[PDB]
Design a protein around this motif. Sequence first.
Motif, PDB file in Angstrom:
ATOM      1  N   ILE A 295     -15.747  38.720  63.863  1.00 57.25           N
ATOM      2  CA  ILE A 295     -16.536  39.504  64.813  1.00 57.25           C
ATOM      3  C   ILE A 295     -17.948  38.951  64.975  1.00 57.25           C
ATOM      4  N   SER A 296     -18.349  38.707  66.223  1.00 56.16           N
ATOM      5  CA  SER A 296     -19.682  38.181  66.511  1.00 56.16           C
ATOM      6  C   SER A 296     -20.366  38.932  67.650  1.00 56.16           C
ATOM      7  N   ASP A 297     -19.606  39.737  68.382  1.00 56.68           N
ATOM      8  CA  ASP A 297     -20.188  40.608  69.417  1.00 56.68           C
ATOM      9  C   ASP A 297     -20.589  41.973  68.833  1.00 56.68           C
ATOM     10  N   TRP A 298     -21.888  42.222  68.692  1.00 64.12           N
ATOM     11  CA  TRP A 298     -22.313  43.437  67.992  1.00 64.12           C
ATOM     12  C   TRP A 298     -21.973  44.712  68.758  1.00 64.12           C
ATOM     13  N   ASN A 299     -21.811  44.614  70.070  1.00 60.99           N
ATOM     14  CA  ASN A 299     -21.538  45.816  70.863  1.00 60.99           C
ATOM     15  C   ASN A 299     -20.065  46.240  70.851  1.00 60.99           C
ATOM     16  N   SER A 300     -19.198  45.405  70.277  1.00 60.95           N
ATOM     17  CA  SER A 300     -17.784  45.753  70.112  1.00 60.95           C
ATOM     18  C   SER A 300     -17.530  46.641  68.877  1.00 60.95           C
ATOM     19  N   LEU A 301     -18.576  46.882  68.084  1.00 58.87           N
ATOM     20  CA  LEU A 301     -18.489  47.757  66.904  1.00 58.87           C
ATOM     21  C   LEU A 301     -18.949  49.180  67.213  1.00 58.87           C
ATOM     22  N   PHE A 302     -18.419  50.175  66.489  1.00 61.29           N
ATOM     23  CA  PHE A 302     -19.074  51.492  66.481  1.00 61.29           C
ATOM     24  C   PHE A 302     -20.069  51.562  65.298  1.00 61.29           C
ATOM     25  N   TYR A 303     -21.128  52.358  65.451  1.00 60.59           N
ATOM     26  CA  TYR A 303     -22.230  52.380  64.479  1.00 60.59           C
ATOM     27  C   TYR A 303     -22.509  53.737  63.840  1.00 60.59           C
ATOM     28  N   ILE A 304     -22.682  53.709  62.525  1.00 55.27           N
ATOM     29  CA  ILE A 304     -23.285  54.825  61.807  1.00 55.27           C
ATOM     30  C   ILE A 304     -24.548  54.288  61.124  1.00 55.27           C
ATOM     31  N   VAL A 305     -25.710  54.701  61.609  1.00 52.77           N
ATOM     32  CA  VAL A 305     -26.963  54.147  61.109  1.00 52.77           C
ATOM     33  C   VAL A 305     -27.808  55.225  60.480  1.00 52.77           C
ATOM     34  N   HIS A 306     -28.068  55.100  59.178  1.00 50.96           N
ATOM     35  CA  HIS A 306     -28.915  56.070  58.502  1.00 50.96           C
ATOM     36  C   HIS A 306     -30.197  56.301  59.285  1.00 50.96           C
ATOM     37  N   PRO A 307     -30.409  57.541  59.743  1.00 51.90           N
ATOM     38  CA  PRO A 307     -31.539  57.863  60.622  1.00 51.90           C
ATOM     39  C   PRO A 307     -32.846  58.141  59.861  1.00 51.90           C
ATOM     40  N   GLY A 308     -33.366  57.151  59.146  1.00 50.18           N
ATOM     41  CA  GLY A 308     -34.575  57.348  58.354  1.00 50.18           C
ATOM     42  C   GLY A 308     -35.750  57.824  59.196  1.00 50.18           C
ATOM     43  N   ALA A 309     -35.847  57.256  60.392  1.00 49.66           N
ATOM     44  CA  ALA A 309     -36.835  57.648  61.399  1.00 49.66           C
ATOM     45  C   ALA A 309     -36.366  57.101  62.738  1.00 49.66           C
ATOM     46  N   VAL A 310     -36.952  57.578  63.827  1.00 50.71           N
ATOM     47  CA  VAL A 310     -36.540  57.097  65.145  1.00 50.71           C
ATOM     48  C   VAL A 310     -36.898  55.609  65.296  1.00 50.71           C
ATOM     49  N   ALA A 311     -37.984  55.167  64.667  1.00 47.06           N
ATOM     50  CA  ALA A 311     -38.346  53.748  64.733  1.00 47.06           C
ATOM     51  C   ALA A 311     -37.248  52.869  64.107  1.00 47.06           C
ATOM     52  N   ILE A 312     -36.583  53.392  63.084  1.00 48.00           N
ATOM     53  CA  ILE A 312     -35.526  52.632  62.436  1.00 48.00           C
ATOM     54  C   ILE A 312     -34.340  52.406  63.375  1.00 48.00           C
ATOM     55  N   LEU A 313     -33.871  53.477  64.018  1.00 52.66           N
ATOM     56  CA  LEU A 313     -32.784  53.363  65.000  1.00 52.66           C
ATOM     57  C   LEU A 313     -33.158  52.406  66.153  1.00 52.66           C
ATOM     58  N   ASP A 314     -34.399  52.493  66.625  1.00 54.55           N
ATOM     59  CA  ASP A 314     -34.889  51.593  67.677  1.00 54.55           C
ATOM     60  C   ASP A 314     -34.864  50.136  67.223  1.00 54.55           C
ATOM     61  N   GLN A 315     -35.312  49.892  65.993  1.00 55.62           N
ATOM     62  CA  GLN A 315     -35.342  48.532  65.446  1.00 55.62           C
ATOM     63  C   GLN A 315     -33.944  47.958  65.280  1.00 55.62           C
ATOM     64  N   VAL A 316     -32.989  48.798  64.886  1.00 55.58           N
ATOM     65  CA  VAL A 316     -31.591  48.370  64.769  1.00 55.58           C
ATOM     66  C   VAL A 316     -30.994  48.096  66.155  1.00 55.58           C
ATOM     67  N   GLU A 317     -31.207  49.021  67.090  1.00 53.07           N
ATOM     68  CA  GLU A 317     -30.743  48.840  68.473  1.00 53.07           C
ATOM     69  C   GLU A 317     -31.279  47.541  69.088  1.00 53.07           C
ATOM     70  N   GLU A 318     -32.578  47.322  68.927  1.00 56.62           N
ATOM     71  CA  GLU A 318     -33.244  46.161  69.506  1.00 56.62           C
ATOM     72  C   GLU A 318     -32.818  44.828  68.889  1.00 56.62           C
ATOM     73  N   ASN A 319     -32.838  44.732  67.558  1.00 55.78           N
ATOM     74  CA  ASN A 319     -32.527  43.471  66.874  1.00 55.78           C
ATOM     75  C   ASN A 319     -31.033  43.121  66.847  1.00 55.78           C
ATOM     76  N   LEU A 320     -30.165  44.072  67.187  1.00 53.32           N
ATOM     77  CA  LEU A 320     -28.744  43.776  67.372  1.00 53.32           C
ATOM     78  C   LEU A 320     -28.423  43.668  68.875  1.00 53.32           C
ATOM     79  N   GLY A 321     -29.406  43.972  69.720  1.00 54.77           N
ATOM     80  CA  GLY A 321     -29.213  43.922  71.165  1.00 54.77           C
ATOM     81  C   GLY A 321     -28.145  44.893  71.645  1.00 54.77           C
ATOM     82  N   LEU A 322     -28.133  46.096  71.077  1.00 55.42           N
ATOM     83  CA  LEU A 322     -27.126  47.091  71.439  1.00 55.42           C
ATOM     84  C   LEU A 322     -27.407  47.767  72.784  1.00 55.42           C
ATOM     85  N   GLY A 323     -26.340  48.134  73.489  1.00 59.43           N
ATOM     86  CA  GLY A 323     -26.463  48.915  74.707  1.00 59.43           C
ATOM     87  C   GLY A 323     -27.115  50.232  74.357  1.00 59.43           C
TER      88      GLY A 323
END
Lengths: 392, 392
Positions: A295-323
């Motif tokens: 697997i190399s397409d990050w958007n083909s995965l479903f995600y469970i991301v520990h919501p430490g803060a909204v900045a964390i979710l944003d940083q994960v979304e951005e650096n993985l280039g998620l929709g």
Amino acid sequence: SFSMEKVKRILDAQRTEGPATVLAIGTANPPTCFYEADYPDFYFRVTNCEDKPELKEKFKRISERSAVKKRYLHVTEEILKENPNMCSYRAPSLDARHAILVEEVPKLGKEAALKAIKEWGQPLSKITHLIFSAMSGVDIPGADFRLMNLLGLEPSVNRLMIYTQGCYMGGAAMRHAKDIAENNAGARVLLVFCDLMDMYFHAPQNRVDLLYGQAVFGDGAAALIVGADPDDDCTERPLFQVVSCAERAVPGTQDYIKAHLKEMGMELHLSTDVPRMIGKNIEKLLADAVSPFGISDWNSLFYIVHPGAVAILDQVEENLGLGEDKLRASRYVLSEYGNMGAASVFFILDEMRNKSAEEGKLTTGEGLEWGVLFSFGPGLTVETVVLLSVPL
Amino acid sequence: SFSMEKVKRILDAQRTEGPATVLAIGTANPPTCFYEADYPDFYFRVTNCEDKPELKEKFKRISERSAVKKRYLHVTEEILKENPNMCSYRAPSLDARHAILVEEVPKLGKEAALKAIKEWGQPLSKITHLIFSAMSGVDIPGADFRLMNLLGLEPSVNRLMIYTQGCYMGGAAMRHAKDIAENNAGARVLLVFCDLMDMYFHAPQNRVDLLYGQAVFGDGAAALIVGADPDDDCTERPLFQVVSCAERAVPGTQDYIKAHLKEMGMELHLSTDVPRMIGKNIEKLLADAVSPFGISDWNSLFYIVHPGAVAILDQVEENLGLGEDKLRASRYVLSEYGNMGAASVFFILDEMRNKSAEEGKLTTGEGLEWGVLFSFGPGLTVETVVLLSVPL
């Protein structure tokens, strides 16, 4: 070698075939709901700090940017009036806080566990293992022992009790459950997280990290039943399958998250650079975990991301280039519950299976096959868990 | 099912063949040795209680009946003078005690671990898992994290940190190590116990259980490397093989051992009926564990018995009808070190392998093939671990 023949019989008997699976999930929260819009008014009144209006404005701006709509909190005005030292910064209050937690932690754990056991549908006597993870309430015997008696588990249940470690414990305790389930045929693990933030409540300070916590930390419990080789001759049914677990201490970040158990309660030190540090490392952690499966397409995965803060979710979304909608379930739990520590990711997992059923998706993982669960905690520790969904 | 084929490849790869084995054992203690004959004089002077001579005589009688000759203790006169509140009963002293422990726990753990790693003889990079068990020193990040950096383990080492649970943790953490080792091919687990009793030090009270603890609790660390399928292409060599682990909460005994983490340190409540309760239950626990291997003669086993007190060893000897020398190694550790909590049984295991080599026995288990390790803690929790020796 006579004896080693007897041992090999035992080992042969215990072998499993498939991966550890989560068979059920149940959650619970303290009764009192605190809406984020009203919390600044509540917080500064009940701590007698209404004479610090500038600090209050600084707190409101943090709360308003938090993307938390509401939280369920164990700490109430009644508790604060009964234990005034919780409101006086650095005043001795550990004994009062522990008194309040020692019964409440296993109690909320039971509420979540009962719901999990109900979904699972099997008798209590089939539970062979109990893992209890709790941020606060350190006591001997522990919450695992209390929960075993509250539920009426077999006296021979194999127990593991883990206190006061932080938000990586979701992924980490899942790894321990996976090892138990897969190494022991017939084992069914009750995994319980109960995180009450009472020890982190303090009078408002001019500290960005303390104010953030005061704005975002919420309370909750989650319970799961984990086991390998689901039995068709009963109503057992997998929700997700646990493929692999990985853990990493990010070098050079020991001081990013520290918390000390003290006479005044929990003394927290949390760097504002944590979300950026996570964003910098997330892609490499993901690639190491799912490259073995091509697997190399990050958007083909479903995600469970520990919501430490909204900045964390944003940083994960951005650096993985998620929709933009990829992290919906994670943001949903942050919005409706806040950051509930280690229990949070399993609220998200619960939320994801329910939303998927409700929307008619073909799998418990938003219609997708492969997924990843991330936990982030001290210091910095990152958990990466690869999941398989189940068809619907 | 494309994906489940990929998963089955992973599962196939991870399979092990043999049982978890202990590949090495190393131990360590605080520098200062306190001889039991002199401890009453030391204890009552340094707590300014020489004006209570009757209580002192009651303490001396307990110490003299303890079958403890000496202990290594972290608490020294210098520490007590630097932190006087440790000597004032119920005075706030938690912050002082934790300050003293937070660095010392991982430090003594490293000393033991290094000795274990040396015996093992393999590179640090082959350690895939770390389990750290500690009675006191609760901190975030924990001692496991500190030890990983002190040793220079891989940042990807899988960690488990267990604080403040009690003396059953020896057998219990071994069970977790066994599951990890057997479910993961190539896994090598570093298992560390570090038990410093500083939190239990208080001014002498007219309480039989507090005085007993003050007379018998000692400090120590033990480290083990645990793994399945020893590699012949290196100098790895098993000392003992772990056949089975069992745990049981003895019904009706919840209140036998309680300890609360408070502002004054650890507040202990321990029933004097614990040794009798253990003696009443021990035979049934042994029979359930070794009957599957056709064993019914208790004297044909070698023994590692958690030395909680001399009454406990006597109760085990008596209710199993053991010959008089059967518990030598267990009594030896109680005599030379006192009760060092969860680490104690592995001091005994270490002692047993050494005495066996020294005496020219044909196995690491006093020449015998089958053996059992017992741990006893809150409340009441009993661990029963069946062992295989290794030939010499």
